[PDB]
Symmetry: C3
Subunit: 360 residues, 3 copies
Amino acid sequence: GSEFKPHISALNAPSLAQRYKDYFYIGAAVEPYQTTKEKDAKMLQRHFNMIVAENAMKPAALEPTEGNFQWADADRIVQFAKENGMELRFHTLVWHNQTPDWFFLDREGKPMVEETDPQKREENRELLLQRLENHIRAVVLRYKDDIKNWDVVNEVVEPNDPGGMRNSPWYQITGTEYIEVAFRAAREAGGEDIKLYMNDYNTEQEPKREYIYRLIKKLLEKGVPIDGVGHQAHVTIDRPPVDEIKKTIQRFADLGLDNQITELDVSLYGWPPRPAYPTYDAIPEERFQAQADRYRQLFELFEELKDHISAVTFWGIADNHTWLDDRAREYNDGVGKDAPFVFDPNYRVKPAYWAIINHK
Amino acid sequence: GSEFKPHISALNAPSLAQRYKDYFYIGAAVEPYQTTKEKDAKMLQRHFNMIVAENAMKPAALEPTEGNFQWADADRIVQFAKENGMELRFHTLVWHNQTPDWFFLDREGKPMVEETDPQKREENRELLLQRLENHIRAVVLRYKDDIKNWDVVNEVVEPNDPGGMRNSPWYQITGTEYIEVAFRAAREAGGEDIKLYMNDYNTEQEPKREYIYRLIKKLLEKGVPIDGVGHQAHVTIDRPPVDEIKKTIQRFADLGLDNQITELDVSLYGWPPRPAYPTYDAIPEERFQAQADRYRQLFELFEELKDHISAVTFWGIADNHTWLDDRAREYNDGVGKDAPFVFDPNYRVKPAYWAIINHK
Amino acid sequence: GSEFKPHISALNAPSLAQRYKDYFYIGAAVEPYQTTKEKDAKMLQRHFNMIVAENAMKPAALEPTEGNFQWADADRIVQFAKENGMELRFHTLVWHNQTPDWFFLDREGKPMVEETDPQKREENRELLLQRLENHIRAVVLRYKDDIKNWDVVNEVVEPNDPGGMRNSPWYQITGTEYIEVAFRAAREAGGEDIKLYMNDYNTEQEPKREYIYRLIKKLLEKGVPIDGVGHQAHVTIDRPPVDEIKKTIQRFADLGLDNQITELDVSLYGWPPRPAYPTYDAIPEERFQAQADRYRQLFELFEELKDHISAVTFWGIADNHTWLDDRAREYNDGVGKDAPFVFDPNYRVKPAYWAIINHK
Ligand code: NA
Ligand code: NA
Ligand code: NA
Ligand code: NA
């Protein structure tokens, strides 16, 4: 144990975004209801100068059937950021998950992935790319003046698949062209001022890192205007090692790319939740102290790499809301709690908060 | 002697604020008449991108009797800053000096500090906190869109007093609650965008440093939204040592606090003015050269700590106006002159100017 | 050979200005036609956040006869920068080249440099300084709200001339007073917010460096409001050595001066073009790899000196347009091609691009 400053309320504790003002933005993923929850709204105004929609801007949320755009939840998050002078990230224009099946049906209502006529396959490819372009055109035309950071594609690399290309219907139907078109359409509709990212997880693992590096070079060679890599950084206390994170950021920086940490959380367990504690009160202090040392190591690394990192965004606000609790229950027969942030479920600061707010 | 660049006019000499553009703001304390004095106004526009009122915004200046707000002098300083794109600091919402006695009278016209009925003392405490809240509400509502930096309380720690709490009437009547309320009211009226400081002098001395650190932690534990510490830095050529200054800034940074240097001057004498020179022309060059080396050491330290220091403000413009001349005369039987700045009384640069403007 | 990343199109390659966002602006010299050439305009929007007129704002371009101001070409460049949020530099208010002869004729139509009556010479000096003041007044009044960076005088030092002062008609008629007046008039018309530079080439050579340093100190002693030195940096692969560049920047920083690199190019040849290659396709890869290592060394030096350098501007966009091709032909009997940029004549990135865009 090394962090023994008091567990004060986070609502008025010194601002995390302030601490990192000349390093990178400090962001949080939010749901629309949190923009009007008193404590969550206060937490955002106190600690965060960047916001991303955890779920409200995924493809199925915004265009659940063709041409039927659903803007209300997304507008709510954008308006909260505008009211409070926060930057925004867009999650996400393209993803194999959270994508409605109408994209991948031919004009006949049948799955394009089953088509065997080569000329018809080329027509389906053209049609799917037009649908993708229209999804992007609508969303970027609406938000381009307010959202500067765009996860144009998400999780398109899978090292277990041939050539490293995740074999989603996107890839089955268009190869890598859906990725090329996604970036071109985003630039066409949004102009030079928006920053376009390829977002993925385990970006430091090999050979996934090579595959992402290879893909970006291939896209660059095709004239694709990519600006950066987003690193989800869903990490644990021990994995991955900090030196591998450092080499990954430097590596993509060598292609001229900006880097953002997009979905940061530090689980208390391994991958998978080998044994979750059942309740929050059951987590011993030693675990939070271990998590504090890990957060310290991460953020001091981010400071060293500050000229290659424009933003660090957490995948949530406080420990009362995190996607890791679904996984904790799942692998522990219905009961389990994770604690991945620097703010606890009662909106108090954790040892990890003091570890990243201090002078180093 | 080490600084032999010419003693050019400061009016058009290279800008001090420019030199520190990516480190911290460079500020000066001013009186309203100096916003319309040709040479002082030019000096501010040339060298400073932050302004503070030396006297015009103290409690007795702004609310000399209850509810009788006097805005003219303060408005003048704020308008000069706005015309010239300068940031502002507010000195100061609460101070045991420069505070009119009406605050501390019960509704009966008698000193609250003399009251012996416990229930009546609690009523006086409530009344004094309401008067404090109204003073802050009026001032912050008026200036919140123009002043980002607020000395919410000033000089509230005194190591000679029990528990380190300066035993002013504020503390005699309310304990530390006046400090809690001062910060809460300032945040309530001004929003999250204004930065709230506790300002004091000798912040590197022990045990004063501990007492300030202890008090801030206690206020943080009560939910108080403090953002930073202001260090007056009324220093001499030899005191305090630079390593103690460094440890102080780092120490408060460890609580997540920003730091500003708020009232910087480097006296030519010890504490007290053991022997002032009678006139400015009597000061030998060796003294200015010693003062230059001291200013060099201070500002190179500030550069090293730049990510913990947002602003460095001098307690005046040029050597023709400084509060240290009152003290120089006082302790030298009516005659005496100090020279605490980098600009001399004829608006020429001093060796100290060249020492902090150069490449290091 | 060390840089083997692909020679992708530069039009959508990761942004150079983005890479240097927290170091200095990245600029390019342009001609008006390039603001409407599809590829040049795209290159500026992709890679550059600062623009300078290669020729359209020289004295003869803007005021070819007395009082006959020609604004169209200059306005075009300023409007392109404004549309795209780019900063601007002004090249240049005073220069011995590109200056129409009407400046230097007495009211009698005869060359002021030939006048032998001392009282008449003082009248011509006064008249030439009034004409200079009016040229500057007109240009600064028109553009002061849009152009922050002003090359007030250009190439006024010549180490082969007595006292180091280039013996142009400006100096023959007014001594150094034309320089004093140029800076004062620019400040008078433009205010404190515009930054005023003395621009020259070979600024690291001795004794030219001493002469510039000496002149600036003399101007500072006369009350002249100079803010910075512009270093043209028309360099080769081997000259000048990087340590001499470093000492030059530090040296002028010691006078409190900002520094900008104003006309950067890295010729493939010596001075003069000892042997140009006849055509672009004749340049071997080894030369581009040598040029890449040189650009790497320069920009890593600029990063180290980032707090003394506000902007780095290239004297052109891509290798299809550069003034060095006139000199390559000249000294090679009509045929010759240089390649001084990081972007090639077909708007593809060069090894030098990868060398300055990477993580270091
Ligand atoms: Na730095
Ligand atoms: Na989720
Ligand atoms: Na005073
Ligand atoms: Na030219």
